């Protein structure tokens, strides 16, 4: 029943004291049901009767699951000091390594097996109400479920009690996840077997019930997502809600569901569902459903009846990652040992950054993978990646950024990433020289865009409703357009300054975006920059009409 | 007994999450922890410590072990309050680790709760290992200051032998500094060494701050006056009698970059007394105790990278280049972390602080690599940048060796 541990001592938050809420009132049926439960508790030592010398006290209520007892720490929480709960970190079916077999032990109700610091206990403190009368008075002398520092205390202290054992048998994995505890070994069945009765006499030891035959977990595991088989482990079927009415809630819904399963299943589309959010009114606003709609909704719905299983992790062979790029700005990855064999997979995205390239991005693909393999396998893989090392190296060695990769190998997979475009590192030659410049008035937004070549050619364009931003980056357009294979260019505009530096090839800007295509077209683009305001001839004459 | 040591006024202890280790770093650290434990300088704490700073291990530039590093900068700032100008001048100066002698001293205990640290479980399987200090940690300033008393001691007796030679402390780090030649150099330094045991190569000189060189040339093209001119207007941020309006008149027209403008006898002494303007560093730029020193990295390409250390914009206390060291090849993040290394290093024995950082890199591509590379017993403060062109172009104007430093 209740372990002979040492308690931890725990502490109220800085500034604050005990709770002290009312008691919500009870029929004179749950009062009942309450004083069972509560004089059972007593006996088995994990409450105490208490003096009315404590001024606190948490609601307790009764609620039919027969019968059963609830209290509400809300406050005591809320009031409570905090603890180190960086156990948030939730392990990847893909790095557990395979086992003969696995047992899994219960310890939930040993909640109530762990002492409460003695000196916290009064916090604790309840009330029975009566049918108004006296009231009967109780405390915990055990950690009481819900309260705040229940998971880490109780974690804490099994992680003590295993300590003995685990030392002893090292060949014998444990994992520990809130009531249950997970022992795997490579142990011929047996002896497995011999080990945990070993195991759970220990336990026994320390007062830890020992779960009835009754409840004893088998395999496969459902945990959390997934179906651990003993050789390898499957993602529970995701099903989509089929109606006849669809409301955008309901979409959302959807769509989100759809997103996450974008994962694990990379042909999965969610265009033509969330096209139906435009304009939308009301959460419960129905919405029909678009044919291209009905088409994806139907889709998706096939696809995910594909069962996606992984495999386990086999720290004598080596991780490799490989990488597509499935369209702009979107990756795709898959983590193995041996072919076909998937460790996991994955897919990235990302939102027209104000301006990149795809081999930056491929880079943040390699990294993002990267972190999380050291945080499921302990190192970084091999990496399979669809560009040249002709290409790599050209990008990186001129890059303004600190940038990298680790060890990794050309994979001849289409689409290869490429640069689109390079400029010009000095004048073309026989190239016509044009001198755009754009002015706008900032205030009522009418502007100037415009140029003048070596070769006497000119164009200005007048345009409202503009910035001055624009009228300069819509100059350049303009050069772009009008001029041949080969162009040099020159402009004061900052910005630009960023495009030669940068050299993106995917804007925010849809202006950027067409002067971009307008670069990727050209064989050779020589830009160049220069102070606005300036002497500086050709950036003169064309600057002071477009002005 | 122990020195009573508090956080600052309204300060918490850190809660610094840790990072991700890889398996090699978690076992070596797991090994170095289970032999501090049994020693008792660490103890194993409970989870009623909400308190954490993040650990990592290092083979130091000399080593086939590892070594464990704590992030104290959190700590650090949190901590409460407690240099021989000659060592920037003495043609050589010696770093020497004593922070392995703050083990021997007891850490407050109303403190040790703020040095809790984790060393973390590959996918996160098991729970990490909480600890906490008993003993002064390193990378903690308050160790050396504590230790501070006993350090002027076991150091007295040297320092009398010896007053020529500068002793200066910083952090885990004593730097010697003398004028004797090497191999007079390195005999003294063993004498010292040897007297430490006994209780349980930089040059200053080199580090002149080189100017910056305009191209000369034989002919110029408009393109050529263009680029130079844009570089100048720039300089005139820090050098205001920088000109142009000569340079920007040979312009006026709309003509090809490529045609070659012949200079006037008038855009050729603009031209030239720019030239001697920047022949030597902006006056009256002295360096205050009581404001930030800053350090700012521009990546220039090809192996090279170029610093400039000030507190404000433009008033550079000093300036300079580095390019890779072989084997750095492929790697910008090694580059980078050795460069910050050895700019850290000079601001400390000039200045005798670490600078705040500027760096040319993507965070997480940072974070997550940096380590690896690290080697010293600090880490200075840094944050992440975006380049602007023209500060870049400019510093890579600065001047070089005709030949450069020769060896037979
Ligand atoms: C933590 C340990 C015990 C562990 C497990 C259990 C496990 C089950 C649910 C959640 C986390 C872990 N498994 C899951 O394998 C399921 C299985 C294996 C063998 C026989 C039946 C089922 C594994 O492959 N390797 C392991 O090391």
């Not at chain 1, 809600?241 to 309901?250: A, G, I, L, Y």
């Not at chain 1, 190192?379 to 303004?400: G, H, M, R, S, V």
């Not at chain 2, 000369?216 to 393109?223: L, Q």
């Amino acid at each position: 029943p209740i372990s002979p541990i040492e308690t931890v001592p725990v502490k109220l938050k800085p500034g604050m004291d005990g709770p002290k809420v009312k008691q919500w009132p009870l029929t004179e049926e749950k009062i009942k049901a309450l004083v069972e439960i509560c004089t059972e508790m007593e006996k088995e030592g994990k409450i105490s009767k208490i003096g009315p010398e404590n001024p606190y006290n948490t609601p307790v209520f009764a609620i039919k699951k027969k019968w059963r007892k609830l209290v509400d720490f809300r406050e005591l929480n809320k009031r409570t000091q905090d603890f180190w709960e960086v156990q948030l970190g939730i392990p990847h079916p893909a790095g557990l390594k395979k086992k003969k077999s696995v047992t899994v032990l219960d310890v939930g109700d040993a909640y109530f097996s762990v002492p409460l610091d003695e000196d916290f206990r009064k916090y604790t403190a309840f009330t029975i109400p009566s049918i108004e009368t006296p009231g009967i008075r109780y405390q915990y002398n055990v950690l009481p479920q819900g309260w705040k520092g229940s998971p880490a205390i109780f974690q804490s202290s099994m992680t003590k009690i295993l300590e003995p054992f685990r030392k002893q048998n090292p060949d014998i994995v444990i994992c520990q996840y809130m009531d249950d505890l997970y022992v795997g070994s490579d142990l011929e069945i047996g002896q497995h077997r011999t080990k945990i009765e070993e195991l759970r006499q220990h336990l026994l030891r320390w007062g830890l019930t020992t779960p009835d035959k009754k409840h004893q977990k088998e395999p496969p595991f459902l945990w959390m997502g997934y179906e651990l088989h003993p050789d390898k482990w499957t993602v529970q079927p995701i099903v989509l809600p089929e109606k006849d009415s669809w409301t955008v809630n309901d979409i959302q819904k959807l769509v989100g569901k759809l997103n996450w399963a974008s994962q694990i299943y990379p042909g999965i589309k969610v265009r033509q569902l969330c096209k139906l959010l435009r304009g939308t009114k009301a959460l419960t606003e129905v919405i029909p459903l678009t044919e291209e709609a009905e088409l994806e909704l139907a889709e998706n719905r096939e696809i995910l009846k594909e069962p996606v299983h992984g495999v386990y992790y086999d720290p004598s062979k080596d991780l490799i990652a490989e990488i597509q790029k499935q369209g702009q700005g979107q990756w795709t990855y898959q983590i193995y040992q041996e072919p076909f064999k998937n460790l996991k997979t994955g897919k990235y995205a990302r939102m027209r950054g104000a301006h990149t390239n795809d081999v930056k991005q491929l880079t943040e693909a390699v990294q993002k993978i990267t972190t999380e393999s050291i945080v499921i396998w302990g190192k970084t893989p091999k990496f399979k990646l669809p560009i040249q090392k002709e290409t790599w190296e050209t990008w990186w060695t001129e890059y303004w950024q600190a940038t990298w990769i680790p060890e990794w190998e050309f994979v001849n997979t289409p689409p290869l990433v490429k640069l689109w475009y390079q400029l010009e590192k000095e004048p073309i030659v026989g190239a016509e020289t044009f001198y755009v410049d754009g002015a706008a008035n900032r205030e009522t937004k009418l502007g100037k865009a415009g140029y003048v070549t070596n070769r006497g050619r000119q164009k200005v364009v007048t345009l409202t409703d503009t910035t001055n931003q624009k009228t300069e980056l819509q100059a350049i357009y303009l050069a772009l357009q009008d001029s041949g294979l080969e162009v040099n260019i020159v402009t004061d505009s900052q910005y630009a300054l960023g495009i030669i530096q940068a050299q993106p090839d995917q804007s925010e800007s849809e202006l950027v975006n067409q002067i971009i295509e307008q670069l990727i077209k050209k064989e050779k683009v020589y830009l160049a920059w220069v102070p606005a305001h300036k002497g500086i001839g050709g950036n003169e004459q064309v600057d002071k009409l477009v002005s | 007994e122990t020195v009573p040591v508090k956080l600052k006024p309204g300060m918490d202890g850190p809660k610094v999450k840790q990072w991700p280790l890889t398996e090699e770093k978690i076992k070596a650290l797991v090994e170095i922890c289970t032999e501090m434990e049994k020693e008792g300088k660490i103890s194993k704490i409970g989870p009623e410590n909400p308190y954490n700073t993040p650990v990592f291990a290092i083979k130091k530039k000399d080593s086939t072990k590892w070594r464990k590093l704590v992030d104290f900068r959190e700590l650090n700032k949190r901590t409460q309050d407690f240099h021989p100008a000659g060592l920037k001048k003495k043609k050589s100066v010696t770093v020497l680790d004593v922070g392995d002698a703050y083990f021997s001293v007891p850490l407050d205990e109303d403190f040790r709760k703020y040095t809790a640290f984790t060393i973390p479980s590959i996918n996160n399987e098991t729970p990490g290992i909480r600890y906490q200090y008993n003993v002064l940690p390193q990378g903690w300033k308050g160790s050396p200051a504590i230790f501070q008393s006993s350090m002027t001691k076991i150091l007295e007796p040297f320092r009398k032998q010896n007053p020529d030679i500068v002793i200066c402390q910083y952090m885990d780090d004593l730097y010697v500094g003398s004028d004797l030649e090497i191999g007079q150099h390195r005999t003294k330094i063993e004498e010292l060494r040897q007297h430490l045991l006994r209780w349980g190569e930089l040059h200053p000189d080199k580090w002149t701050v080189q100017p910056i060189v305009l191209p000369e040339k034989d002919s110029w093209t408009v393109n050529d006056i263009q680029k130079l001119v844009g570089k100048l207007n720039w300089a005139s941020q820090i050098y205001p009698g920088i000109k142009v309006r000569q340079l920007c008149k040979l312009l006026r027209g709309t003509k090809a970059l490529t045609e070659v403008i012949p200079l006037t006898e008038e855009a050729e002494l603009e031209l030239a007394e720019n030239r001697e303007i920047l022949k030597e560093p902006v006056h009256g730029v002295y360096y205050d105790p009581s404001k930030d020193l800053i350090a700012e990295i521009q990546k220039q390409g090809q192996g090279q990278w170029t610093y400039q250390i000030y507190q404000e914009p433009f008033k550079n206390l000093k300036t300079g280049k580095y390019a890779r060291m072989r084997g750095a090849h492929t790697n910008d993040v090694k580059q980078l972390t050795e460069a910050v290394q050895k700019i850290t290093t000079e601001s400390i024995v000039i200045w005798g602080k670490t600078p705040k950082f500027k760096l040319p890199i993507q965070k997480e591509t940072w974070e997550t690599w940096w380590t690896e590379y690290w080697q010293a017993t600090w880490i200075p403060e840094w944050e992440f940048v975006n380049t602007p062109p023209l500060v870049k172009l400019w510093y890579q104007l600065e001047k070089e060796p005709i030949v450069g430093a020769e060896t037979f």
